Amino acid sequence: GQKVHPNGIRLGIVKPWNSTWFANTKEFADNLDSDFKVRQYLTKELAKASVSRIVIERPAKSIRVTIHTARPGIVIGKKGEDVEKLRKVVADIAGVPAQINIAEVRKPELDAKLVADSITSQLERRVMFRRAMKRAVQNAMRLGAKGIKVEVSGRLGGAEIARTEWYREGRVPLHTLRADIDYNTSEAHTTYGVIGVKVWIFKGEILG
Amino acid sequence: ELQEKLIAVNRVSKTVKGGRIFSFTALTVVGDGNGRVGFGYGKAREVPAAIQKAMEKARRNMINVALNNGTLQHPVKGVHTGSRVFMQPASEGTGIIAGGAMRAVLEVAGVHNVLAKAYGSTNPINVVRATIDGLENMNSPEMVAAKRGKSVEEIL
Amino acid sequence: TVSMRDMLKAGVHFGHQTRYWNPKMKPFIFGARNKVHIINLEKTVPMFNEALAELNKIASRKGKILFVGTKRAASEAVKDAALSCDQFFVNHRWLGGMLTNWKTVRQSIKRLKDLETQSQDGTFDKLTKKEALMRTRELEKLENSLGGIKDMGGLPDALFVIDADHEHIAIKEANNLGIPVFAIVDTNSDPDGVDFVIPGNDDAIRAVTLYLGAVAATVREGRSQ
RNA sequence: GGCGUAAAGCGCACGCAGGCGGUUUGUUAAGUCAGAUGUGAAAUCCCCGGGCUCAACCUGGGAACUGCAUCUGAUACUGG
RNA sequence: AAGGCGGCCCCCUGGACGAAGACUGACGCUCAGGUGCGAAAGCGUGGGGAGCAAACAGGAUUAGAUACCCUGGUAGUCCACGCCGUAAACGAUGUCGACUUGGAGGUUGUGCCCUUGAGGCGUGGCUUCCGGAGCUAACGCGUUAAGUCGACCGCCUGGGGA
RNA sequence: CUGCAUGGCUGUCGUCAGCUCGUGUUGUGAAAUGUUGGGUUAAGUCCCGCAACGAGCGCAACCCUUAUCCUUUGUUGCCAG
RNA sequence: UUCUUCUAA
Ligand SMILES: [Mg+2]
Ligand SMILES: [Mg+2]
Ligand SMILES: [Mg+2]
Ligand SMILES: [Mg+2]
Ligand SMILES: [Mg+2]
Ligand SMILES: [Mg+2]
Ligand SMILES: [Mg+2]
Ligand SMILES: [Mg+2]
Ligand SMILES: [Mg+2]
Ligand SMILES: [Mg+2]
Ligand SMILES: [Mg+2]
Ligand SMILES: [Mg+2]
Ligand SMILES: [Mg+2]
Ligand SMILES: [Mg+2]
Ligand SMILES: [Mg+2]
Ligand SMILES: [Mg+2]
Ligand SMILES: [Mg+2]
Ligand SMILES: [Mg+2]
Ligand SMILES: [Mg+2]
Ligand SMILES: [Mg+2]
Ligand SMILES: [Mg+2]
Ligand SMILES: [Mg+2]
Ligand SMILES: [Mg+2]
Ligand SMILES: [Mg+2]
Ligand SMILES: [Mg+2]
Ligand SMILES: [Mg+2]
Ligand SMILES: [Mg+2]
Ligand SMILES: [Mg+2]
Ligand SMILES: [Mg+2]
Ligand SMILES: [Mg+2]
Ligand SMILES: [Mg+2]
Ligand SMILES: [Mg+2]
Ligand SMILES: [Mg+2]
Ligand SMILES: [Mg+2]
Ligand SMILES: [Mg+2]
Ligand SMILES: [Mg+2]
Ligand SMILES: [Mg+2]
Ligand SMILES: [Mg+2]
Ligand SMILES: [Mg+2]
Ligand SMILES: [Mg+2]
Ligand SMILES: [Mg+2]
Numbered sequence: 001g002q003k004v005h006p007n008g009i010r011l012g013i014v015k016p017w018n019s020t021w022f023a024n025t026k027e028f029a030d031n032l033d034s035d036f037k038v039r040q041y042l043t044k045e046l047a048k049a050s051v052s053r054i055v056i057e058r059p060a061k062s063i064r065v066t067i068h069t070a071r072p073g074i075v076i077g078k079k080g081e082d083v084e085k086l087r088k089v090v091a092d093i094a095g096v097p098a099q100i101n102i103a104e105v106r107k108p109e110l111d112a113k114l115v116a117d118s119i120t121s122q123l124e125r126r127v128m129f130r131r132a133m134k135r136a137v138q139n140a141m142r143l144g145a146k147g148i149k150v151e152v153s154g155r156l157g158g159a160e161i162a163r164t165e166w167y168r169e170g171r172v173p174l175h176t177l178r179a180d181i182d183y184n185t186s187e188a189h190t191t192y193g194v195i196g197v198k199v200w201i202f203k204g205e206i207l208g
Numbered sequence: 209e210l211q212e213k214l215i216a217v218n219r220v221s222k223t224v225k226g227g228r229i230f231s232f233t234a235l236t237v238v239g240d241g242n243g244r245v246g247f248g249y250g251k252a253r254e255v256p257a258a259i260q261k262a263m264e265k266a267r268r269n270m271i272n273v274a275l276n277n278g279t280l281q282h283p284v285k286g287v288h289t290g291s292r293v294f295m296q297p298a299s300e301g302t303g304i305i306a307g308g309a310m311r312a313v314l315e316v317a318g319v320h321n322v323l324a325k326a327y328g329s330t331n332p333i334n335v336v337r338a339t340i341d342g343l344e345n346m347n348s349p350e351m352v353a354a355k356r357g358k359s360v361e362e363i364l
Numbered sequence: 365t366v367s368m369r370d371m372l373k374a375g376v377h378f379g380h381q382t383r384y385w386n387p388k389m390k391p392f393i394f395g396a397r398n399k400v401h402i403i404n405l406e407k408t409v410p411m412f413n414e415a416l417a418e419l420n421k422i423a424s425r426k427g428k429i430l431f432v433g434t435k436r437a438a439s440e441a442v443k444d445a446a447l448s449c450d451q452f453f454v455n456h457r458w459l460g461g462m463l464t465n466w467k468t469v470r471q472s473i474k475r476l477k478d479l480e481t482q483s484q485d486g487t488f489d490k491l492t493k494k495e496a497l498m499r500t501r502e503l504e505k506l507e508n509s510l511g512g513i514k515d516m517g518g519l520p521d522a523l524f525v526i527d528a529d530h531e532h533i534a535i536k537e538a539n540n541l542g543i544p545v546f547a548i549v550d551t552n553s554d555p556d557g558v559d560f561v562i563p564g565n566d567d568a569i570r571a572v573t574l575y576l577g578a579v580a581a582t583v584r585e586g587r588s589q
Numbered sequence: 590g591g592c593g594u595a596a597a598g599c600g601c602a603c604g605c606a607g608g609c610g611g612u613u614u615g616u617u618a619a620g621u622c623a624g625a626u627g628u629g630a631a632a633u634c635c636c637c638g639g640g641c642u643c644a645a646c647c648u649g650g651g652a653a654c655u656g657c658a659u660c661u662g663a664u665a666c667u668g669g
Numbered sequence: 670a671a672g673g674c675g676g677c678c679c680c681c682u683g684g685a686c687g688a689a690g691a692c693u694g695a696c697g698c699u700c701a702g703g704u705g706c707g708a709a710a711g712c713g714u715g716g717g718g719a720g721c722a723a724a725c726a727g728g729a730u731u732a733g734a735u736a737c738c739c740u741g742g743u744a745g746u747c748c749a750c751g752c753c754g755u756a757a758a759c760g761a762u763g764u765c766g767a768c769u770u771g772g773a774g775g776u777u778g779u780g781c782c783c784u785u786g787a788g789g790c791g792u793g794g795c796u797u798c799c800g801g802a803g804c805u806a807a808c809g810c811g812u813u814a815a816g817u818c819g820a821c822c823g824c825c826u827g828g829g830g831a
Numbered sequence: 832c833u834g835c836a837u838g839g840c841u842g843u844c845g846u847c848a849g850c851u852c853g854u855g856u857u858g859u860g861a862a863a864u865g866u867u868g869g870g871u872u873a874a875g876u877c878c879c880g881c882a883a884c885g886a887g888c889g890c891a892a893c894c895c896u897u898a899u900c901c902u903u904u905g906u907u908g909c910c911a912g
Numbered sequence: 913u914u915c916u917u918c919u920a921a
Contacts, residue, residue: 001841013894147887154837162837168852171887178893187838194838205893220861226850233860249860253852289806289859329806334859387770387801460864460882465855468884533882536856 006183014206021058037093049074052113063094066101070108109139116186116199123188147172147202155193172202212238213312216332234258238266239316246270274348279321286342290329293338298323374570377403379551389551392563401551408563415560416582422522423586432534433526438572445576449583453512463537479503527566528553
């Protein structure tokens with residue numbers, strides 16, 4: 001358990017929280033359950049949508065869910081068709097009036113949750129894991145990432161001895177605190193077990 | 209237009225403090241179907257990366273071989289470090305009669321009629337060096353005529 | 365184009381002692397006076413003039429010439445000769461793989477330009493002044509090594525070497541790439557790696573100026589033609 | 590094919606039999622080389638054919654049987 | 670020749686080398702079997718016996734200590750004459766001959782320059798170190814070859830068993 | 832039930848200064864060089880040298896806290912006048 | 913000064 005989580009260590013410096021609200025201790029853990037249930041529901045519902053980061057914010061007892069996705073067309077559908085379907089079930093879960101905003105993800109090859117899920121979706125339909133890791137790195141360094149490191153782990157190709165492998169291209173400074181390391185993690189539930197995928201993407205140093 | 213053949217891939221090792229580090233070596237030879245022959249030996253952590261380093265070095269340092277019609281010109285011998293190698297010009301359409309690593313280097317050499325035998329150690333790295341060394345000092349009827357200072361017809 | 369008493373006054377016939385000489389230099393040594401070999405200038409002149417003709421041959425078709433000498437006594441003279449006929453020089457240490465591993469040194473040629481651009485032309489004063497000296501000593505170091513070839517861009521077409529064994533690394537890189545080699549091959553050097561061998565002294569400052577000016581002429585004479 | 594270190598130079602030396610032998614001329618013709626003759630059974634193998642509807646098979650002619658003997662030469666080499 | 674040879678003196682005695690000639694005229698090289706030599710240890714007979722020292726004894730050390738360490742100590746070591754015939758008897762490289770770039774030495778002759786100093790220029794023998802080509806699995810060898818060849822001999826054929 | 836089918840997470844060597852790659856070169860090859868040497872540093876830290884030239888992960892800095900000053904704002908905090 | 917040994921895949 002050597003390495004710190006690169007998102008959680010940068011949360012005061014260059015990364016924002018995925019939930020930015022306030023409550024006292026009386027109403028804290030109910031909100032944190034309320035934030036958890038909608039991230040649970042939307043991830044299950046928008047699985048085919050390439051959703052990356054669900055940002056939750058609640059002013060004045062009214063939740064505002066900001067969905068980041070690579071394509072909003074499958075999230076919206078017709079104009080106020082699926083978003084309005086998803087808005088009324090958030091209000092059932094959160095118990096407050098809801099609001100869904102959609103921020104489009106330019107360059108989905110440079111977003112760690114999308115890249116990790118692309119590797120997972122490829123690994124689930126039984127592709128060669130090494131081929132999937134090459135194309136995930138080549139697409140990001142072409143699109144302009146200053147450095148990407150991907151990593152799969154355990155039970156690769158149904159081999160009984162589970163091992164981990166990782167590729168790296170460009171510089172990925174994890175110890176630099178002002179480094180924009182986009183880090184997120186996916187899991188592939190293959191027929192031979194569970195393959196965990198990690199991906200680090202370095203965009204550049206924020207000079208605050 | 210340069211046909212490319214890998215002869216053998218091999219996994220080597222290197223023991224460090226953490227344990228064994230594995231690596232892969234690749235022995236490839238290229239050729240144009242004529243006297244331009246060249247081999248390469250690459251090495252990397254991964255098998256497709258190792259053949260690519262081998263194909264890269266094989267495309268330069270080519271060597272030129274004065275062939276006959278489709279065969280060699282005189283029975284020549286070649287040695288390198290474990291492998292004395294005999295090869296012989298042969299009649300038309302008898303095929304490449306050659307062993308293992310020697311088959312791959314003569315096929316991209318553009319010969320088609322050889323009678324070969326690899327004596328000694330048949331390690332693919334040294335026997336592919338022994339044929340290239342064997343083919344390089346093979347001399348033409350033109351080369352011996354200019355050297356001895358006679359015509360081709362006085363040599364017959 | 366250079367007479368024998370030109371060579372005899374500068375000290376081309378001088379060499380090294382009898383405990384340092386190479387037996388391959390036997391067709392070029394005349395005799396041995398005061399335990400120092402004497403270079404046969406009867407064979408120096410028609411071979412050095414055969415070499416200057418090929419310089420006039422290669423620099424006619426706009427070939428690139430690289431001067432190679434890092435003897436730390438003839439370091440300034442090999443720079444001044446290359447700036448006369450505006451060709452390329454190596455006065456401080458020949459980097460291992462400067463020709464064969466050109467594609468990595470190319471990534472330092474571009475770095476040499478950007479450090480000269482940023483500080484001199486870009487005028488990037490008022491930065492963190494310890495890095496401002498780190499920018500300075502970087503540009504000082506790269507100009508000291510790659511400044512003589514920073515406008516060359518590609519591989520040269522002929523190589524002029526001051527010493528055939530002191531710059532033996534540059535001989536091997538030229539032998540791989542098929543580039544012809546011009547070298548002052550002294551008695552303590554190896555005359556096999558040089559494509560056009562020129563006998564002569566190596567430590568004589570007068571002879572270094574004598575050798576280079578005969579080359580700095582036939583490049584300028586070869587450039588206009 | 591090997592023998593410093595992988596199996597392998599006798600601990601060293603003298604020396605009989607044996608193997609080998611500088612250079613020049615003459616002679617010899619033993620070796621050697623060439624030719625011829627005799628012989629090397631047939632079958633078999635090989636080549637070109639022929640015959641069984643093809644093939645296996647059968648068969649004509651040839652080459653081969655690389656040997657040995659005798660004779661006629663050749664004289665560089667080796668021997669005398 | 671190998672084993673080997675160490676104060677000094679004498680007697681007997683083998684070999685090498687050099688300088689110039691003179692002379693014999695292939696008289697040579699190698700060698701199974703054979704014969705001779707052959708360290709130390711050992712054996713036989715007869716001496717000798719200071720020191721050293723297997724064996725053995727005592728002391729320590731140690732879990733034990735038939736060892737290392739200590740104090741003693743006998744064959745032995747020494748001489749004469751025989752025998753044994755073996756060693757990592759090694760350069761782990763059989764002998765003889767020819768050719769093939771160099772450098773720094775050691776030793777031992779000999780010629781030459783005015784020895785104008787122990788110097789200058791050569792020319793032989795033997796020897797040490799480094800190293801090029803070449804060779805070699807590599808290490809390395811490298812004009813004293815493990816390079817390039819010739820003549821003859823000895824020997825090898827998986828590890829044990831042996 | 833199987834941590835000896837795994838993911839995730841953690842100890843540990845060890846906050847030890849190390850660990851590697853690209854191209855080049857050397858070696859038939861395993862590999863080597865770089866990364867060694869001279870100094871120096873907490874540090875593969877830096878400088879010089881060098882068949883290496885570069886780059887990456889780390890050793891450092893960027894972060895938090897503490898240590899002095901300034902400006903701004905003074906209640907539920909403060910009391911010199 | 914003395915200071916030994918460690919099986920299983
Ligand atoms: Mg931690
Ligand atoms: Mg074998
Ligand atoms: Mg054998
Ligand atoms: Mg042994
Ligand atoms: Mg042996
Ligand atoms: Mg012997
Ligand atoms: Mg005998
Ligand atoms: Mg004779
Ligand atoms: Mg005769
Ligand atoms: Mg006869
Ligand atoms: Mg006859
Ligand atoms: Mg028929
Ligand atoms: Mg018959
Ligand atoms: Mg005769
Ligand atoms: Mg007489
Ligand atoms: Mg004898
Ligand atoms: Mg005795
Ligand atoms: Mg007894
Ligand atoms: Mg006795
Ligand atoms: Mg007695
Ligand atoms: Mg006594
Ligand atoms: Mg005692
Ligand atoms: Mg014995
Ligand atoms: Mg001895
Ligand atoms: Mg000795
Ligand atoms: Mg022996
Ligand atoms: Mg040597
Ligand atoms: Mg040999
Ligand atoms: Mg020999
Ligand atoms: Mg040998
Ligand atoms: Mg475990
Ligand atoms: Mg685990
Ligand atoms: Mg347990
Ligand atoms: Mg089990
Ligand atoms: Mg490398
Ligand atoms: Mg190589
Ligand atoms: Mg290291
Ligand atoms: Mg290393
Ligand atoms: Mg150092
Ligand atoms: Mg560093
Ligand atoms: Mg026991």
